[PDB]
Amino acid sequence: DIQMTQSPSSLSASVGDRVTITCQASQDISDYLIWYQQKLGKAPNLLIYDASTLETGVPSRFSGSGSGTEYTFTISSLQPEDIATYYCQQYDDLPYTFGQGTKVEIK
Amino acid sequence: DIQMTQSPSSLSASVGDRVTITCQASQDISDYLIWYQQKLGKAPNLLIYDASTLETGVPSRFSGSGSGTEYTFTISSLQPEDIATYYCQQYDDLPYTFGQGTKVEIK
Amino acid sequence: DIQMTQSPSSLSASVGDRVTITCQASQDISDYLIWYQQKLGKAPNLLIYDASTLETGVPSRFSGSGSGTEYTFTISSLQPEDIATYYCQQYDDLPYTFGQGTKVEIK
Amino acid sequence: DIQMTQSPSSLSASVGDRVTITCQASQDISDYLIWYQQKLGKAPNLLIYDASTLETGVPSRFSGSGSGTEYTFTISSLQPEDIATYYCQQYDDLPYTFGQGTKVEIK
Amino acid sequence: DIQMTQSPSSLSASVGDRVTITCQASQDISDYLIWYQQKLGKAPNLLIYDASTLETGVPSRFSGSGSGTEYTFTISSLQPEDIATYYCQQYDDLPYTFGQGTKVEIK
Amino acid sequence: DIQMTQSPSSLSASVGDRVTITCQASQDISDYLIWYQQKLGKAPNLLIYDASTLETGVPSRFSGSGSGTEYTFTISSLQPEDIATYYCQQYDDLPYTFGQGTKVEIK
Amino acid sequence: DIQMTQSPSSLSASVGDRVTITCQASQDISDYLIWYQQKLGKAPNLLIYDASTLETGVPSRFSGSGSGTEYTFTISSLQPEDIATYYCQQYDDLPYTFGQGTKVEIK
Amino acid sequence: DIQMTQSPSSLSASVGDRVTITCQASQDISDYLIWYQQKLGKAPNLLIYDASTLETGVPSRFSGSGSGTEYTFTISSLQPEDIATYYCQQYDDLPYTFGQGTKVEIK
Amino acid sequence: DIQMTQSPSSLSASVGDRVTITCQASQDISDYLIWYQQKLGKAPNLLIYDASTLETGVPSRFSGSGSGTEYTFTISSLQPEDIATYYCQQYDDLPYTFGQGTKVEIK
Amino acid sequence: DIQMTQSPSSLSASVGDRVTITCQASQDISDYLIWYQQKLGKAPNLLIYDASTLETGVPSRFSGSGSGTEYTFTISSLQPEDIATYYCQQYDDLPYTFGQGTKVEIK
Amino acid sequence: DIQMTQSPSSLSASVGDRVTITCQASQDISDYLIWYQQKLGKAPNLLIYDASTLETGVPSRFSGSGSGTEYTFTISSLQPEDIATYYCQQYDDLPYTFGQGTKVEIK
Amino acid sequence: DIQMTQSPSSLSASVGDRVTITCQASQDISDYLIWYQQKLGKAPNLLIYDASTLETGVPSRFSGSGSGTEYTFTISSLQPEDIATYYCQQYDDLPYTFGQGTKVEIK
């Protein structure tokens, strides 16, 4: 029910470039936000849990800032292995809803 | 982080062929299992929760059952629109963990 | 001289979506940042100068802000017309260095 | 403001003799003219500034000057590596208007 | 014999634009050079002769420049009917060599 | 000016026959008539100067004759390479005039 | 059966444009050459015989000359009524043989 | 002078149909009659020479009977390649006069 | 049965011209041949019967003659009225077979 | 002689029921009546003779008879392929007069 | 209910001609059939009723034929005023069905 | 006969209003009045039988009422499909009579 609006739809960046991606909660998801990396044909992996906390084993190069209905994802220094798809998912209340997803390509 | 296990990884069934995919967990993820349908290059969407609870709008043909450490998803008659990859995910304990996923191809 | 890095290269998004871009200067380029939008076949066209100020003729949708080294350009609501390439160019010292450019697209 | 007018919009040669390009200013502009080349794809790389002074690393094949209002740019020997689109930019004051541009060819 | 090398071969300019064709002769010559305007399906017509002297009638915007081995043909204001191909012929020594040609199209 | 009359406009025949073109002059220009080969979009090219004298390189197939004010052109045997527009120009007085041309072509 | 050879196959001349068509024979067809004028869908009619002898009623503008193995037909001023196909034919020796023919079009 | 009257003006016939065409000599042409086939845009070819004799290489299917002022042409068995125009020509005395011509079409 | 072939189909001729038609019978139809002229919208109208005999009401211009298998119908002088279609019909055995018909026209 | 009178001259139907056509004789004619159909374009093809006996290959849909003086022809079911014009011919004796005819339609 | 199928829809006959319309009823009926003559811009007038019984006054040439399910309307002599459209109505059972119609035009 | 009076002759109104037509009878025909729909050249069609009773298929917009010798017709709301001539026929006695009709039409 809660609409998640994520931008941009597609991306590119030279190695080591400051990337940012956003999701827009149609309602206040109270920071209940998780970030996922979906490699080319694999299950989604959890990066952040509740707006800004990273999962253990996840580099500090990946980060998230946010509040209210605006959270953001950053890959300070892009990397080849970073090529994937990042989705956000409000887990504030079921139906748990993913944002559209951001393809992330290296030029 | 409860490990999940899906199977199989791909299945070519035929128009109207009953499919049964299974996700096995590593703890009593209780009733906190959710089944997603993800179409080519689109965001995983929620079809069912509480191991078997359809979300309001889903075709009846999707049914889910099983409890505790094992769960099964079912599509009685497999229609065109269903060619998607189906993943499960446990919303019982962070990090909300998915299953390996299954690629449902048509025959 | 003064090296400009612009992020990202290309970026397809949809209408109304916020679009944010950045570009960093090799050294302090204290407020002297021009943003250029360039449509194919046409030539660079001013929109903002001094990093924040908009050339009197640009929508209030296009905006620029940034603190002394890291500047960001923002399109609050993509409208099909915005299909172009934007270049950030520093003019604190000659040669005036533009950044790599960001091709914004529809999808 | 200051309107620039370059000529032509397309301009060719079989390597050697002259490649001249017109760029007429809308009012006196000291000699704060500049010349960029956009090797189609990348961003503009400037060759001359202050009307006639080449930058560092730029071939003796490229030149131009004039004053007041009229400036011609010459490629005094078309080399193949010189495929590009050249622009002129008055930088007397803001906005920094642009010359329509010229697509230089080889034929 | 004498070898005339014209440039460019084709160029795009607009109404009001200043085009410039250039023609170099293999040897010195004083002024035995002619400029012709061959219209699409017609025989060459004489514009300027002896370099800068222009025949009776030819519009004021037509000019030839030169005093030895380097000459220029200028169309001050490029107009809809000025579309043709231009030529440089040396009537100094026989055979009467022509420069290559500059087909002039509008925009 | 000296009015020139060339004929015909067009001429189409087989790769082996005769192509005889004529040119009359408003003034017996003595013997100051030239013969050109105008291949599809290449500058004119001298073939015969002063009614009959062939220039070096010219194949005997092409001959010219004519006294005072009436001259004819003649390719004894048409070769496929002879596809062009053929022009007569008088180099007796000024301005140098031409005849409409003759797009000689095979069938 | 004396082979005959006409040329050219078609010619666009202008109102008042002198036309010269030639028929070459393979033996001394002597003076036994005849020139016909054939209008669209009408019977070839006789304008001249004995290589050059006008038939009583023909416009003076038709003249024929040449002798032995070569013959030419002429129309000094080409008028409207003349758009026809002109063939020659030898009445020297059976089978009375024509020439390839020429299509005289107007310009 | 001698009028040749040929009938019909136009014809048609299924493959293999007995065709006859006539010419009427206004004077007794003493069998000096030739038949010609004029294919769609080609020179006239001689079929018969002197009322009834065929030219060598001409099928026997084509024939001619006649005397005095009445000769006839027959194509016993019409054929596609027979599509043409047949004219008769008295060659008894100049002016050699052709009959009007018979278009011959296949239905 | 008894097959009738009529030649030719259509035939445009001019006034006073002889017009001759034929039609052959598959086997001996010893003298029993009717000729029919049919004007558009009207119906077949007798003119001759028995091959030679004319129905008392027909011009002496229309005639028929023929030896046992091959019959010919002749119109000595076409007059505009004769625009019709003629059919030859055998009546030596039922079914009485007409021939294909000959549409005679003006031109 | 014997005058036939058919009715109507035009006669239609929407396929199925009856199509009757009158043809009244001028005197007794045994039963030597005949019925032809001229599919517009081609010649008449007979269907019945001796008043009521069909020919070989003619559909059972076509019939007719009567005697003495009156004969009606019926199409007992209008088929589309039956567009035509039907005639009747008395063949008692000569001339073989015709019935005015009837243009059968479908509407 | 009962379904009357008339035929033909239109016919052309001449003065003195015998027209015949036919009308079939869906079921048996004894004679409850009427024939009407609707004149161009008028209400239907009753001609024959109960099939063959004709109303007082109607001209003698009018007749109806029938005794069960097949009926015919005959106009012995088609006259100038007989031009109308005819109809068949069954007053056996309600609703009172009509046959289609036969518009009768003269010639 | 029973004289019928219908009114009016013509009636023109808008697609939505009322069309009320009347019919009086020379004899109170009791209730044996019928109502027809006469669409441009199609057989009549029953609408109401015995003053008021609608036949199956008939839309209620059309109603009828009337005792003995005076009946009215009524389309409550005129629809564009109702374009026709409307007739009254009495089926009480013989011969069955009608009223002039009523070409009801829009504007």
CSV table of N, CA, C and O in Angstrom, one decimal, chain H residues 9-10 24 29-30 32 46 81 89 98 103:
chain,number,residue,atom,x,y,z
H,9,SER,N,-6.5,-1.3,-87.7
H,9,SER,CA,-5.6,-0.4,-87.1
H,9,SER,C,-5.0,-1.1,-85.9
H,9,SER,O,-3.8,-1.0,-85.6
H,10,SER,N,-5.8,-1.8,-85.1
H,10,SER,CA,-5.4,-2.5,-83.9
H,10,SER,C,-5.9,-4.0,-83.9
H,10,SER,O,-6.9,-4.2,-84.4
H,24,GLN,N,-3.5,-1.7,-98.8
H,24,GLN,CA,-4.1,-1.5,-100.1
H,24,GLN,C,-3.3,-0.4,-100.9
H,24,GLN,O,-3.3,0.8,-100.5
H,29,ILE,N,1.8,-1.4,-107.1
H,29,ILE,CA,3.1,-1.4,-106.7
H,29,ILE,C,4.0,-2.6,-107.2
H,29,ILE,O,5.1,-2.8,-106.8
H,30,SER,N,3.5,-3.3,-108.2
H,30,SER,CA,4.2,-4.4,-108.8
H,30,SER,C,5.0,-5.3,-107.9
H,30,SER,O,6.2,-5.6,-108.1
H,32,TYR,N,6.5,-4.9,-105.2
H,32,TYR,CA,7.6,-4.4,-104.5
H,32,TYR,C,7.1,-4.0,-103.1
H,32,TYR,O,7.0,-2.8,-102.8
H,46,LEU,N,13.0,-5.9,-91.2
H,46,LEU,CA,12.4,-6.5,-92.4
H,46,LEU,C,12.1,-8.0,-92.3
H,46,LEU,O,12.9,-8.8,-92.1
H,81,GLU,N,6.0,-13.2,-78.4
H,81,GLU,CA,7.1,-12.4,-78.9
H,81,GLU,C,6.7,-11.7,-80.2
H,81,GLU,O,7.5,-11.0,-80.8
H,89,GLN,N,5.5,-1.3,-96.8
H,89,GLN,CA,6.1,-0.2,-97.4
H,89,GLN,C,6.3,-0.6,-98.9
H,89,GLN,O,6.9,-1.6,-99.2
H,98,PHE,N,5.1,3.9,-96.3
H,98,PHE,CA,4.6,2.9,-95.4
H,98,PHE,C,3.1,3.0,-95.2
H,98,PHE,O,2.5,4.0,-95.4
H,103,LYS,N,-1.0,-2.5,-84.8
H,103,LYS,CA,-0.6,-2.8,-83.5
H,103,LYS,C,-1.1,-4.3,-83.3
H,103,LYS,O,-2.1,-4.6,-83.9
